[PDB]
Amino acid sequence: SDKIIHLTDDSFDTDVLKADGAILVDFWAEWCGPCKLIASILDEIADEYQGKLTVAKLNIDQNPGTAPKYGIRGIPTLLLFKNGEVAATKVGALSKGQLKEFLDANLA
Ligand SMILES: [Cu+2]
């Protein structure tokens, strides 16, 4: 977890919106089962894509203000921001392979 950014409603506008590059935001909560699966593979993802991707997590129970700004309906939901704009969206549980496919198709 040394490369995973911990976001809050208070730092989202700065850490995400004012950043140029690609940032993957993982919206999760402790009660969400599928979220735990995705969480166990992020450290590997952050290492493999470092230099071209930053991985961040935001707990919606502790920080309830951000998700509604993007109309998120449920979790897990992964949003890929590029220079402060949503460039890709993925909802539901996914295997390591599917996540890697989602990233390769959307990054550069
Ligand atoms: Cu780490």
UniProtKB/Swiss-Prot annotation:
Query: Which InterPro entries has this protein been placed in?
Result: Thioredoxin, Thioredoxin-like_sf, Thioredoxin_CS, Thioredoxin_domain
Instruction: List, in alphabetical order, the GO biological process terms annotated in this UniProt record.
Output: cell redox homeostasis
Do the record's keywords include rRNA processing?
no
- Gene Ontology terms, cellular component aspect? cytoplasm; cytosol
Note the PROSITE patterns from the entry.
Answer: THIOREDOXIN_1, THIOREDOXIN_2
- Its function? Participates in various redox reactions through the reversible oxidation of its active center dithiol to a disulfide and catalyzes dithiol-disulfide exchange reactions.
Relate the assembly described in the record: Monomer. Interacts with bacteriophage T3 DNA polymerase.
Record's protein name = Thioredoxin 1
Q: Which organism is it from?
A: Escherichia coli (strain K12)
